[PDB]
């Protein structure tokens with residue numbers, strides 16, 4: 478393979494204590510003679526699936542648990558198999574965050590939740606509600622200070638406020654049911670936009686800018702995680718850590734993250750990675766080394782969390798955590814976060830209204846589950862000849878109308894392309910499920926190679942249905958679902974922005990309206 482044997486390459490995010498992780502890597506290297514190299518690559522969450530998909534990258538990947546299901550679904554992660562005794566050392570709910578389709582896919586490291594961080598010298602008694610912040614800012618502005626600054630370039634920091642009055646990602650599961658553009662999410666984001674409009678916040682504010690302003694004593698409040706406390710210590714700001722403000726009487730609900738360590742599927746050092754993580758990192762001395770660099774929050778190791786739990790900053794973290802919710806690790810979390818990131822930024826800058834911004838994020842977040850439902854039902858009914866009598870569910874009218882339209886249009890497309898599809902199927906060799914995997918690599922390169930329209934999308938799906946029929950014919954009907962997922966994955970990954978612009982399958986329905 479591409480990844481070197483007899484070495485350990487570890488990737489972790491730049492806001493985390495990588496120097497302390499490196500210290501742990503030095504202890505491993507001292508004992509074993511095996512080199513350990515810690516890196517903190519830019520845009521790590523995107524760079525890992527890119528390089529791992531080619532069989533390259535690090536042996537160990539660090540991130541919050543939410544993106545690991547996507548990595549697993551893409552076959553980028555090795556199943557981890559700790560013994561019972563090691564499992565019993567970590568909190569059961571942390572293992573839950575790294576379980577995907579029955580299988581553990583990472584070692585949970587620490588529980589991360591956003592808190593309100595405030596300057597005691599400027600703000601002795603921090604606001605219990607979001608609604609008193611504008612007035613609080615006015616008071617402070619008279620003294621040369623602002624009330625609140627936090628990163629507005631990542632939806633992670635804004636999500637507590639969005640979710641406060643009833644906003645949610647995926648109902649808890651029902652992945653089809655998405656609450657990104659409901660009334661509560663709209664209210665939450667609207668308040669945020671008004672803070673900006675009324676000059677209480679700046680739309681351009683990011684992580685560095687916010688951190689800098691707070692640690693320089695310029696703003697009385699920031700919103701951040703445990704990892705940030707180190708820099709505030711160095712700045713000597715008299716700071717406190719408390720519960721996030723409420724919005725409309727309801728608690729802010731931070732989407733809780735579990736920093737986890739995964740093992741590259743293509744790593745030839747899986748046993749080494751296992752030794753490092755279990756016997757060097759997930760120890761009292763291991764977790765402390767990292768914690769002393771940048772705080773981890775509430776760690777998964779029971780023995781060490783018992784000592785840290787006494788810290789009122791940790792207690793506050795867990796208080797915010799208990800009011801929020803653990804992230805899903807479903808594969809389309811990446812799409813969700815991207816959709817919401819854009820929505821928050823576009824609303825903040827005025828590029829979009831809150832209503833339209835959230836609608837798009839709603840469509841983006843629905844896109845994979847909506848598309849799979851239609852494509853899977855179409856391929857299955859084309860193969861067997863009989864429709865699925867099961868209710869569509871959430872939405873519902875969109876799924877049903879899109880399938881009707883796909884049937885009508887797809888019939889003429891399959892008839893006309895029958896000779897072309899026969900030729901394409903013979904050129905490939907789809908005998909079993911092992912061959913379905915290869916298909917996506919051929920589709921993705923070809924289908925993304927021109928101007929997009931609904932016509933080409935129907936052709937793709939129709940070839941899907943054609944292959945589905947063939948699979949049933951040769952007694953490989955079990956492959957129809959993986960095929961539908963592969964086609965769906967290709968469609969939604971390569972044409973995401975186009976599809977959103979088209980208002981998703983509503984556009985497909987309208988375009989072919991008879």
Ligand SMILES: OC[C@H]1O[C@H](O[C@H]2[C@H](O)[C@@H](O)[C@@H](O)O[C@@H]2CO)[C@H](O)[C@@H](O)[C@@H]1O
Nearest residue numbers: 490492541543544589631632633734814
């Ligand atoms: O903003 C979207 C982003 O949210 C979370 O990322 C967090 C991460 O969990 C924290 O440990 C810390 O590094 O802050 C990040 C936000 O900048 C999700 O984990 C991530 O997948 C998502 O893209």
Ligand SMILES: O=C(O)c1sc2cc(F)ccc2c1Cl
Nearest residue numbers: 897898901924933936937940
């Ligand atoms: O991108 C497109 O429009 C086309 S043309 C074509 C021909 C085939 F035999 C199979 C798929 C396909 C696809 Cl997608």
Ligand SMILES: [Cl-]
Nearest residue numbers: 574804805806
């Ligand atoms: Cl989960």
Ligand SMILES: [Mg+2]
Nearest residue numbers: 833836837980
């Ligand atoms: Mg729209």
